[PDB]
Ligand binder design. Structure first.
Ligand SMILES: Nc1nc2c(ncn2[C@H]2C[C@H](O)[C@@H](COP(=O)(O)OP(=O)(O)OP(=O)(O)O)O2)c(=O)[nH]1
Ligand SMILES: Nc1nc2c(ncn2[C@H]2C[C@H](O)[C@@H](COP(=O)(O)OP(=O)(O)OP(=O)(O)O)O2)c(=O)[nH]1
Ligand SMILES: [Fe+3]
Ligand SMILES: [Fe+3]
Ligand SMILES: [Fe+3]
Ligand SMILES: [Fe+3]
Ligand SMILES: [Mg+2]
Ligand SMILES: [Mg+2]
Lengths: 294, 675, 684, 281
């Protein structure tokens, strides 16, 4: 163990990723969410009850990355300056985690929150995706550790990030998504980093081992995606937006692969996202004698 | 399903593939608002007869008004309104009207008025019974031309009402009586909902002696403290304090905002700039040592003119500060907390027509009038009732005015309606105001939608053809106001007191309008007035009017003033003041969702190159336009400068210099890009 | 080889020898030096009393309005006589305080123009208004030390460039903005020339009362408090007070402006606090039960009289009864609790036992509030104004003309019916000139009531002198019959006054004096000295203690001719003059054998109790060691006689408890105390 | 594994530590260390050399608190929300360490940093003081971990936290001190929470076991006490204020003991220091 000199650096990104991920740091008490109450109320019995469940789903992921997700990727990082970034991400996930509970308190009641919490505990496809990543985390394979995480960071959050987004495209719960967008922008980075750091340990690998990794990613994605279709088919059942979420995922699946040096898989007739949703993803001195003039 | 007007309005923040705005969803939201809120909440009446009757007997409307007309003619007028064909323009409009303006029940669950109703009531209140005039106002507010200020519109005709006009300018004198009275004056005025400004200029400096015994007085700061607390008490509820740039406290007066809810306004004389030119020092003269030696209160002497002499007089204690750094600190504080507002003493006086010297401005830098000190016995009663200033306001929709050909009628009806307000304004709580408003007939006819209109007729803002219109516009409004005012005096058989000394009486006011430059400098402009059916006043109209005044006088002291229209602009669909829009779609913190969106008037996906947002149109351009107005309007004009968050002190100071030199009467506060 | 400056001489007072014997001499030494070092090298030497007045008038120091009411012959002679009475100062602080704070100095301050006696003269002259014999009378009453016109009557008499003669004030606020407004102004125009003011908050609407039928509106009393609070911080000299019922809704938050758990947000820092507790507030504490705080709004609505004008102890159940009259509820045992917690840290609040005051009240109507020093208890009437703030009905408000008597020197003088007589005339005179221009509600109320406030001082002096342990059988019994004999004489005077003028204090026929129901308790027996020590002391002093025969002659005279003054006496604490006149504060015990004062360019000026030697130390116990008991005991006996109030400072150690204060508060109630000043804690 | 609920919190302290520890957010780039530039030259060659050397151990200290300290305690935590705060602390400490490496670049030079760092590996009074503290992080014993965590935060850190506070009092390098103002304020809460949650752990450990650790606290804190005496005396050598820092470590190790629930060890005469150093705190 040697101390950190943030002056003799190994990789460019360590610093600029540290400069971003800390600039855009945020807290959930900073967003006026009490103003979404009126739009919240207008959502149906079924509609409200969904929005709760997807955030609860969002929670699980964010929680995993915090305690077992990012932590495990420290053991694989090369530059001592990467781990410092890693610790920030670890923390940040937990702020992502605090947020929903800051929503949950504000918009709904623990009569509705607790029924969605207990569903989340028992809901088969949500726990499955939580399981897939976990079995690849505690695995001793370091390259697959990153892929999994990328697939979490770049794709898994987005089966649920669609609803606070879609709403925003209707003028409902704008400020809830306003807060979500800050999560998003942090998780965008997360994907690029671990991804970039994946390609890195990858170009160092065996030429023949590079086929092994390329297939497995697609396979794992293909499984995680399979699950995700059944995950969206259950929650969003009785709304009929499935076709938009199932399209969103595809787009968000290319997003993951393109961060890992891999080429897109779903053609843009499957990743066809409505531009409105795409849009919702992001919107002293002195004087002079002279100056005095006239 | 589900498209609540509030989610529908929100759709104004979103686009399509070419770069579109969804205006569609606004007018759609209005249609929604009337059917999700308004008509399910209003109460139905068989005929206006019950409507009038029940609303009198139940204790909402005031009979004191109607009884001045044949009850026949009241329902005659009401019908005329509800058939005028008024629909709404913006979502915010109808939102603002209904929630804030319209008459609802005592418990507050049902609506009792609609737009066309509120007009009728005001039209009947202002006309005092004049059948022929009651009609005219109804038409003029309904067609959207004349628009009474927030308090006037709101309150008229209601029995359970507040005050007709908020906005007051009362000076404090350098004695405990007047200080006291002033601290009370706040209490009685702020509780009725008033916006009061005070003239601190007169009071003893810090370290000044009281009762012959040396180093005693607290300064101007602790007098504020009390006033602040008084405003803090009486809620609605906001105050401003004006100080002369050459009062010895100025820096520790500026330092208070470096004392939360008060507004600072600094009166800067020409000599301050002149000192600031050659990097020199300033002189701050003791208000006490002026009183003794020159037998006049500080705020009442020509600081610019005397200056040399003052500095020479050894009995007057001079305090020295840095001119360059003054303008600096001024900027510093504006950067942060908005004010200090500025008004340029001499600039104002120079082109003031009324006898005397102005010293201060209102809470919004727009009202500029002369006043006299009030003298009190030890029991706080008036041994000499002075004159202080109250501001009756109302504005015109530049565009809507330009459409109808009888711009004259459009103006008279408005000036008369405005005048009517003073003849009904009896603030007994502070007599100087009331007795001043009893001799002055002070009014302030405003404008709005200039930007809307220019850009509607296709003119870019700040352009050589823009200024050219706005100049020859004010020119022609002015003529009609003065005419309306001259006529009024002829009918009442009395001029405002102090007229015999006015420049209108001397006729050196008419001096300007008897020369030229008064023919259009651009063909595009001339087209407008040709096309609009407006006869631009010709030399022998002024020449006929000069000699008219010089016989019968004018009934009003000060005629126009252009305010920074608050909510009234959103009811009448107008681009704020006579300045550019703050943005293409104004985001405003209101009601349930915490924000309501406002699209600029006459805006489509086609003319979007006209609606350049203020911030980046630039400072200079705004002044440039305002200059042309400052030319004609006898009072001040509320000038708000719009800088980018990256701009620096210099920029501001540089912009103020220009503004100063261009001859701006008054400056409001400076806004930075950050929302 | 030299050294000893008169200040270093005065500090020696605090230094002992071996076992511990006070250097009483080193203060008297200081006096001699104080004059030798500072006073006389700084006085203006006037070749004859003849050029003096001639120089002091022309040069604009002395008020010619006074002197020209007598032939200069008399004036010169009186002066000459005043100086021939041979006055000598007693203690250092005594002298020092006079010159620095009271005596006449040249415009530039740098020289002195008057000596003690000179002041007296002027005072004596100003108060006489033109009466040769009264002027001579006053001269002697003051220089002997029997009379002392309170600070503001002393310091500001005779001088041409002068401030007001009275400096204590009681103003009221009515539940409307006009009076709200007029209150801040009066807080201004009064405090501006060093006038202490008290305000009546009891009347204002509560912390959420609707305004003009529109629900939940009004701000409370706090914001009016704050306005005044700062308004006093401007007019600086400048001490303010406020009084609010125990059963007025804001009471728990009102008590919480002083609480440390604030700063700006629910905080007042200069204003003094007064709390009115009616008798019932105790009954509710008894059965642990809750207090019912009523709406002043809803009371004014239903009943037609504003809050503090109607009964609260006597109308309590009848007010819970009315369901139109709103009701908030909190603990009574916790109210009294908080008081002590506020009392511990802040000193306040004061206390006025509403009914104990109204039952002893001999005057028409009700008393609703008290003053900054809890010692004024008079009846006011509200005022009505136009919207322009011009007075429409100029109601009565209270100004306090105060004076004092040295118990010891009074018992020394032969005639006491002169000692008191003179005292009353001068006071009356003060109140016959108090034309307070700025608040006409105080001026024309004063011009109606002719109310005066004669005090008593040097009790723990006279007691200690004559070998009486404070609060002992001998003490109590004496002070009982002392306040007794003073009272009679005070009235007899007021009766004679009402006879010289042919008029009484307006609305006399409604007073208990006019029916004779005042003379009730003075005509049932009990007025024999409980101790022969006390009897032989009244003999030694030669005082005709008022007979049952006297209490008839007076009764029959009063009923016939009237009395010129609504109120004759009130006993304030002496904080300034009790050093000029050498007196043991009020009638309460001394503060320490040698008191430390935070004044002058030492930071410490020390003051030795009068008549105190190295022999009689056991008679001079500091009020702390006495025990709030004996103190209340002595105060009760006084309160029996005095028509107005007696300012009561209670004295506690740092070991004292939240209950210890609460406990005394009750012993004060039970024994029949009218009012309470604040409670002190032992630390310096 | 179950998702977090910050709407059914378990311990009152959890959120208390959260709210303000997260409100106490700051960065080295927020403070202009471009200001300490003129005041930096006014130190001697050996004064300037020890500027780095004091902060160099401190750079390694937050390095070990960040990478190893909390990371082992997240299996010990009882409320999942406790796992949450620790990870901020982990992160916050990496910035603390970054802050020192913001310092060695605003005023300090290339040549000089390559001397105090390489010294921090050739320095046994530093080496061991980090070796022992970690010997309890890489021990499966939790109270050994938290005690180490406590004394690291509240004693072993304070080897170089005196230098800038003495600097600050003379107006020399105060904007650098304005940053260690932030740093300490964080370690304050860091030491406290670890401290409070040490005391919750002792509610379940038996009667004799409370002294298995009470006595074991002394063996260790005074073991790393004398290794700190060594580190202090060859650093504050020819300065003269070796004995004012002597009183400093007996002050905050009485606050370190306080940051566990125990009683303070060193008397009036050993814990009383410079009153102008504490005023600038
Ligand atoms: N803070 C404070 N300000 C005062 C006081 N007296 C006067 N001032 C301030 C407020 C007024 O603006 C200014 C003049 O007040 P006045 O007319 O009450 O002073 P006065 O006539 O007693 O003496 P003057 O002839 O004005 O020097 O001085 C005071 O006692 N306290
Ligand atoms: N916070 C606040 N309190 C006010 C205001 N106006 C009056 N108050 C308070 C102070 C007075 O104690 C009480 C009554 O005030 P007024 O007698 O001036 O009200 P007014 O006679 O216009 O109608 P009212 O007596 O309420 O039926 O309410 C205000 O604008 N704001
Ligand atoms: Fe996340
Ligand atoms: Fe992430
Ligand atoms: Fe740290
Ligand atoms: Fe730490
Ligand atoms: Mg004056
Ligand atoms: Mg009222």
């Amino acid at each position: 163990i040697s101390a950190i000199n943030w002056n003799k650096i190994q990789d460019d990104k360590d610093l600029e990723v540290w400069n971003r991920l800390t600039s855009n740091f945020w807290l959930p008490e900073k967003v006026p969410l009490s103003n979404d109450i009126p739009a919240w109320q207008t959502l149906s019995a079924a509609e409200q009850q969904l929005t709760i469940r997807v955030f609860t789903g969002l929670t699980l992921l964010d929680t995993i990355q915090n305690i077992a997700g990012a932590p495990s990727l420290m053991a694989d990082a090369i530059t001592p300056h990467e781990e410092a970034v890693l610790s920030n991400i670890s923390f940040m996930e937990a702020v992502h985690a605090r947020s929903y509970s800051s929503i949950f308190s504000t918009l709904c009641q623990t009569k509705e929150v607790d029924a969605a919490y207990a569903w989340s505990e028992e809901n088969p496809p949500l726990q499955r995706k939580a399981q897939i990543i976990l079995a690849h985390y505690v695995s001793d394979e370091p390259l697959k550790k990153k892929i999994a995480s990328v697939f979490l960071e770049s794709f898994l959050f987005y089966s649920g990030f669609w609803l606070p987004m879609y709403f925003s495209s209707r003028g409902k719960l704008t400020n809830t998504a306003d807060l979500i967008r800050l999560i998003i922008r942090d998780e965008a980075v997360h994907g690029y980093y671990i991804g970039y750091k994946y390609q890195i340990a990858l170009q160092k690998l065996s030429a023949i081992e590079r086929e092994e990794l390329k297939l497995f990613a697609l396979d794992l994605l293909m499984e995680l995606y399979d699950n995700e279709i059944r995950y969206t088919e259950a929650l969003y059942a009785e709304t009929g937006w499935v076709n938009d979420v199932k399209a969103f995922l595809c787009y968000n699946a290319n997003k993951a692969l393109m961060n890992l040096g891999y080429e897109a898989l779903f053609p843009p007739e499957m990743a066809d996202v409505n531009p409105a949703i795409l849009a919702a993803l992001s919107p002293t001195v002195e004087t002079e004698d002279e100056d005095w003039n006239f | 399903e589900t498209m609540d007007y509030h989610a529908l309005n929100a759709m104004l923040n979103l686009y399509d593939k070419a770069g579109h705005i969804q205006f569609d969803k606004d007018q759609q939201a209005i249609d929604a608002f009337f059917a999700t809120h308004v008509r399910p909440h209003s109460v139905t009446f068989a005929s206006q007869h019950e409507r009038l009757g029940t609303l009198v007997r139940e204790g909402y409307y005031d009979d004191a008004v109607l009884a001045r007309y044949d009850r026949a003619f009241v329902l005659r007028l009401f019908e005329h309104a509800h058939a005028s064909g008024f629909r709404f323009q913006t979502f915010l409009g109808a939102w603002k009207f209904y929630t804030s303006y319209t008459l609802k029940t005592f418990d507050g669950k049902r609506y009792l008025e609609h737009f066309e109703d509120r007009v009728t009531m005001v039209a009947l209140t202002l006309a005092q019974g004049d059948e022929t005039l009651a009609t005219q106002l109804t038409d003029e507010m309904l067609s959207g031309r004349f628009q009474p200020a927030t308090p006037t519109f709101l309150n008229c005709g209601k029995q359970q009402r507040g005050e007709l006009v908020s906005c007051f300018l009362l000076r404090i004198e350098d004695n405990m009586e007047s200080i006291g009275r002033a601290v009370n004056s706040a209490l009685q005025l702020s509780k009725r909902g008033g916006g009061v400004a005070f003239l601190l200029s007169n009071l003893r400096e810090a370290g000044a002696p009281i009762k012959r015994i040396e180093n005693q007085s607290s300064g101007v700061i602790p007098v504020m403290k009390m006033l602040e607390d008084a405003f803090s008490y009486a809620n609605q509820g906001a105050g401003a304090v004006y100080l002369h740039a050459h009062h010895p406290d100025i820096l520790r007066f500026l330092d208070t905002k470096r004392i939360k809810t008060l507004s600072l306004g600094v009166v800067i004389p020409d000599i301050t700039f002149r000192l600031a030119k050659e990097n020199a020092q300033m002189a701050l003269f003791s208000p006490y040592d002026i009183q003794r030696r020159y037998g006049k209160p500080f705020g009442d002497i020509a600081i610019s003119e005397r200056y040399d002499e003052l500095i020479a007089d050894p009995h007057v204690r001079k305090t020295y500060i840095n001119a360059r750094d003054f303008f600096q600190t001024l900027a510093e504080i504006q950067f942060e907390s908005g004010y200090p507002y500025i008004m340029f003493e001499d600039t104002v006086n120079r082109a003031n027509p009324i006898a005397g010297r102005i010293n201060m401005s209102n809470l919004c830098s727009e009202i500029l009038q002369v006043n006299s000190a009030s003298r009190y016995d030890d029991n706080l009663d008036y041994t000499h009732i002075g004159h202080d200033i109250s501001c009756n306001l109302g504005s015109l929709n530049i565009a809507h005015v330009m459409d109808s050909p009888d711009i004259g009628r459009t103006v008279e009806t408005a000036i008369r309606g405005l005048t009517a307000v003073s003849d009904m304004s009896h603030i007994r709580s502070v007599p100087s105001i009331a007795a001043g408003n009893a001799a002055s007939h002070a009014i302030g006819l405003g404008q709005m939608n200039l930007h809307g209109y220019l850009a509607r007729e296709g003119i870019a803002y700040g352009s050589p053809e823009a200024l050219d219109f706005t100049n020859l516009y004010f020119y022609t409004i002015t003529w009609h106001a003065v005419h309306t005012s001259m006529r009024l005096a002829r009918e009442r058989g009395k001029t405002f007191a102090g007229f015999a000394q006015s420049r209108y009486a001397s006729g050196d006011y008419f001096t300007q309008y008897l020369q030229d430059d008064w023919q259009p400098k651009t063909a595009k402009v001339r087209a407008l007035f040709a096309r609009s059916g407006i006869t631009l006043p010709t030399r022998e109209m002024w020449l006929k009017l000069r000699d008219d005044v010089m016989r019968y006088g004018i009934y009003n002291q000060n005629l126009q003033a252009v305010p920074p229209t608050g909510s009234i602009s959103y009811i009448n669909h107008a681009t704020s003041s006579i300045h550019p829009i703050v943005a293409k779609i104004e985001i405003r913190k209101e009601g349930k969702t915490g924000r309501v969106y406002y699209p600029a008037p006459f805006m489509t996906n086609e003319n979007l190159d006209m609606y350049q947002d203020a911030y980046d149109i630039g400072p200079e351009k705004i002044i440039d336009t305002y200059a042309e107005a400052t030319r004609h309007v006898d009072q001040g004009l509320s000038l708000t400068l719009f800088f980018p968050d990256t701009a620096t002190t210099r920029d501001i100071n540089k912009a103020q210099i220009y503004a100063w030199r261009k001859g701006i009467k008054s400056l409001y506060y400076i806004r930075l890009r950050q929302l």
